[PDB]
Design a binder for this molecule. Sequence first.
Ligand SMILES: N[C@@H](CC(=O)O)C(=O)O
Ligand SMILES: N[C@@H](CC(=O)O)C(=O)O
Ligand SMILES: [Cl-]
Ligand SMILES: [Cl-]
Ligand SMILES: [Cl-]
Ligand SMILES: [Cl-]
Lengths: 242, 242
Amino acid sequence: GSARLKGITLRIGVIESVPFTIVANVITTKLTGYVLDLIEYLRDKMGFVADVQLAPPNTSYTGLVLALANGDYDIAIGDITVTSARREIVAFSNSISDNSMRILMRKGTLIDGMDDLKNGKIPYNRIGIRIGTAGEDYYLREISGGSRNFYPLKSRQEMYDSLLAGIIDVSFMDIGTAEYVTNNIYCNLTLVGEDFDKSTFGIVTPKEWLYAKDLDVNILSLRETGILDNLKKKWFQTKACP
Amino acid sequence: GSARLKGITLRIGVIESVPFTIVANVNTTKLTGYVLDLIEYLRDKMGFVADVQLAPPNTSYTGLVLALANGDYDIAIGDITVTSARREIVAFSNSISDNSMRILMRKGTLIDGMDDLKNGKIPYNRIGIRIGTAGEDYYLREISGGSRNFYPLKSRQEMYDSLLAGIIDVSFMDIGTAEYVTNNIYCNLTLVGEDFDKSTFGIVTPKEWLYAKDLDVNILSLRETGILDNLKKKWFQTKACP
Ligand SMILES: N[C@@H](CC(=O)O)C(=O)O
Ligand SMILES: N[C@@H](CC(=O)O)C(=O)O
Ligand SMILES: [Cl-]
Ligand SMILES: [Cl-]
Ligand SMILES: [Cl-]
Ligand SMILES: [Cl-]
């Protein structure tokens, strides 16, 4: 059957990613961003108690999904890509956003786009890929014919640091955060080529979840009334870099 | 619980909409299009037995959803918009396509965008709306404050004929089919303004369906491997108009 979430306490997994989920050390931690605002909209509308739980550091996106599937959270909200492999083990709400990926590199690097990766212009071990991301599965399917021959990265920070230090030549990033970081944080990083892997972000829930309909109806309502677009503008329509 | 669809007969509701589901006579009816190709892809991967059932000629999109909810079909596949109100009574698969709407008009008409409809540049009886479509709920929320004061249309054909005959000045149409019709069939109709009501198309299923996971995993696999993009290119890239 089904039921409403009013009165229910949800352990909500979130995962650090600026400006979706922003973690500030203050003197304890304070969370802000698109995700926290979305949670407030849902909490206010649906009446659950939000127990927001930040995933341990270097928890991967796949790791978060697996932790939820094992019972560690009730839902997980973030820049979490809906994939076939994940859908085998968890359900997803209606999509909160479209998504695609872009190629991230250091400015001045002689790469014109994806054909340069697919034609072997870049040594495979100088392509950095964040393990436990949807981008890893894309790489393995479309670039390397299944071979794990990329330079593995444990976090976005390692991705940025390795690019800037010249340890890797390129990586992949979701478009929203890719634009955000290159337009606001690392002015010397840039995006190149057409976007790829058109996909979506969804809220992760247990399979056959009692509260599936309540959540979906609410997400769709926020879509239809322009709230999701408002939140995207609020958090993403900014550019500090000259 | 859950089950796989292999060997199981699915009654699949489809609805006329070129080039998603294209209906030809000779007496017998022949069906072709993106939808029919998609059914074949899913059938081959999942192993179900497809019992494809064209909805009666005058069936509306809301009517199709309600027919499914009533048990008249097992799933429905088409250019069917995922909306909050529909999600109250049926579930939807992971999206098969993004969607948005555009303003449809005769070439030459002096309309800049949605502002003209909101500012009252157009008499309400000269705005045609196809009843029982998602666009009707958009009109009611954004334009008329709940009043059904539009020129009601019973079909796309009535929409085109009424625009060409000058009985109405504008209507709304989903972008995929709007581009197709104005680029191939009605060369003297055109689209104007920014797209609006960003949404998705999904396969309609019963709520709490036994087979939800099997279907979603397979749809996401078709997305990831590029089949959905191939199908879109195949059916929508054409442009016959000079
Ligand atoms: N959206 C990706 C994470 C990332 O690329 O940052 C995922 O869910 O795996
Ligand atoms: N996609 C619309 C139908 C249409 O606009 O042709 C719906 O599901 O209501
Ligand atoms: Cl959706
Ligand atoms: Cl499920
Ligand atoms: Cl989706
Ligand atoms: Cl449901």
